Symmetry: D2
């Protein structure tokens, strides 16, 4: 009944949307969950909503020392990580003409740099046979107006799942990317989507759950599109 | 606890390997399952092993009238299909030089022709919001010695999931392809696979369960690789 | 100046559209060209338009003996094949509901079966280091209404390029697939296409020329999309 | 005879390997060529070997003002750009464990940040109907030990071809990515490659030529693999 019974999960991007829905689903499947976020107020609200088996940890995953501190807390409280959902992400639209160095740095710092170190520093805590899930995007395989840096960053994320699959296979750690389409969160995409609607965060959490759980035990390095068919037709 | 409670599932290629393991997993998740196969002896043994909530139906999915008969039986016994796992398939190795018209016809009849009609004739029984899973293969995206017709057929299968996604969206029927790598069934592949081993049929069944269940409700038209990383790195 | 000087080229689907434009461009680059077609009248007109260094050969590439005859003629006239452009293809639209066995057989006979034998029988005439080009389609990676069998067949074509790449590498024969989008030949696609127009057959011929010529000497097994960006964004 | 007659071409990563070979092939096809590099000595040697119709420009493409300076010189000497080959790249191997912030910044600065600004600042000089070629890599779709940041950066590059194809279509500028496999430049890859050898730089220059020339006039947003079939089988 409980597909993550007694597993320990860390979820970055934990206060908002997908992170939050995933946290609830993970708890419902009997996991212990750390949610991670920059803003303490929202994190505590998120933990309140989740209600049980959850620790909120304030961290800016773009800052190495914030990561060290998060992992020190995770080690003290629960020892080991079974499931890491690296889901922090931020989108700002700018066309090629409009790109400034600050815009470039913001996007790649949060989407790629932050991710790399999030995963690097989780390594000593990750259990052999554990599962790592990266949040890429349908943007990583599309040519969307003004999504230059975001799409490019998200393609870099999908690439990391491949590389990390190779590098961590000795320890049997699976790494897979999830690529959401339009998810209803805090009509153009809905028109082009075969399912004819935006996804619910619950539906994304459910896909992440697959990758987190034993059901995906022979699935490695993939990009799982969860986009109602958008990129598939 | 029961992810397919009271759902009706049809599984072609039902007596052997993947089909069998999927049937057990589906029953364990509270589904009613029809297994389909050419050989009555093996089918009845398969149904024996499954043990409950199962009807064995003798049919050659390459023969239209056998399909009509199968769906008549399904209609009488259970009325509607929630989950169709079109998994009949057959591999014969021949290089390009060796290809005979009989070889070509065998491969495409069982892998593509059979499949098309299996799905066409299920349409009137398929519930709105139901889920169809096609069995493609890693071969469909590789250049394997002597796999000419098989690989090409399996690439045709993957294509059909895209087309049917578009055509069946009005009825909310999801169609998705599963692409197994090496599965242990009735060392070359295991060497190149990041997970360093062949997959267990149970592991493939678990992937098909994802696509069958509500957890994949926003997943449509995809090719889900279940190959331990073989085609991803 | 002449990128195919004294090379011998065979082009199936030789009377119409892409076949014809490729034939002209090949002749312009100093090739000797066989065009192949079912209808003698049109073939002779095509040969008239091409004007020089061309033999028209009547053949139904779906019929093995027609192939044997074509290759006997090619052997008698020029001895060897440097470039084989297997470009025979036919599209009929039918939804899944509408598919009849005749429709299925027509599409797969012309698109896949014919192609397999066209290339099988060219093998003894193909020069080591030669270049084979298969005509797939953007349909082979899309979910287009009523294109069920065509898209699936074209996906089987793209797969054959990969297999044949592996099988023929010992003889250094390159096999590559070209995937046209909308080509003006004997507004929906033009709208979705970044270049905002259908392609001219000359533009497709130019892409096939790349694959035919030494310029693509380190390109093998690829799917070259010539679609103004349709499948790429 | 001259596929780039009187066109003006800008080539970053100009002094070494692929940059160099491409410069030679461009001049041979009647182009005027600017090569761009950090080291003045090697640039001048490169210019010497090319021999005619070439200007060497010292610039660090990671530095905005260096780009401004480059483009001012191009504007003074030739006015406009027909072909931009953005080909500056640098590889350093580090596993996930070994990644430092400096290694991350080095790789992304040269491969992605540099590229974005190279193309941004070319825009005012680029001719309508011109052609931009990006250097990606086979790494951008593989999982290669210790290629973490390089592979991820090269995936970001291939994504930018898709985005820029959409943003620049109004001006009819084509953007395409070239993805080399193993190129002989200043046995593991050669073993897995169907062509059984590493590629010569000339062979990569020839592929870039295709994308640069009118032959590829209907090809947009693609990833052109020039890898002997490495990623295709």
């Amino acid at each position: 009944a409980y597909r993550l019974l007694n597993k320990t999960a860390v979820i970055t991007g934990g206060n908002s949307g997908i992170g939050l829905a995933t946290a609830k689903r993970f708890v419902a499947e009997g996991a212990y969950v750390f949610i991670v976020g920059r803003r303490r107020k929202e994190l505590e609200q998120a933990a309140a909503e989740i209600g049980r088996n959850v620790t909120a940890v304030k961290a800016d995953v773009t800052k190495l020392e914030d990561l060290d501190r998060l992992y020190a807390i995770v080690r003290e409280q629960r020892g080991s990580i079974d499931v890491l959902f690296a889901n922090s992400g931020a989108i700002e639209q700018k066309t090629l003409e409009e790109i400034t160095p600050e815009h470039y740095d913001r996007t790649f710092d949060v989407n790629v740099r932050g991710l790399i170190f999030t995963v690097q520093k989780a390594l000593p805590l990750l259990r052999d046979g554990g599962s790592v899930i990266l949040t890429s995007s349908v943007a990583g395989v599309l040519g969307l107006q003004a999504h230059d840096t975001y799409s490019a960053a998200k393609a870099a994320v999908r690439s990391l799942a491949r590389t990390w699959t190779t590098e961590l296979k000795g320890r049997s750690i699976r790494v897979n990317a999830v690529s959401p389409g339009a998810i209803d969160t805090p009509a153009k995409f809905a028109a082009a989507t075969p399912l004819g609607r935006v996804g619910r965060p619950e539906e994304l959490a459910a896909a992440v759950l697959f990758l987190a759980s034993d059901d995906s035990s022979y699935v490695a390095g993939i990009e799982l599109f969860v986009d109602g068919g958008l990129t598939q037709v």
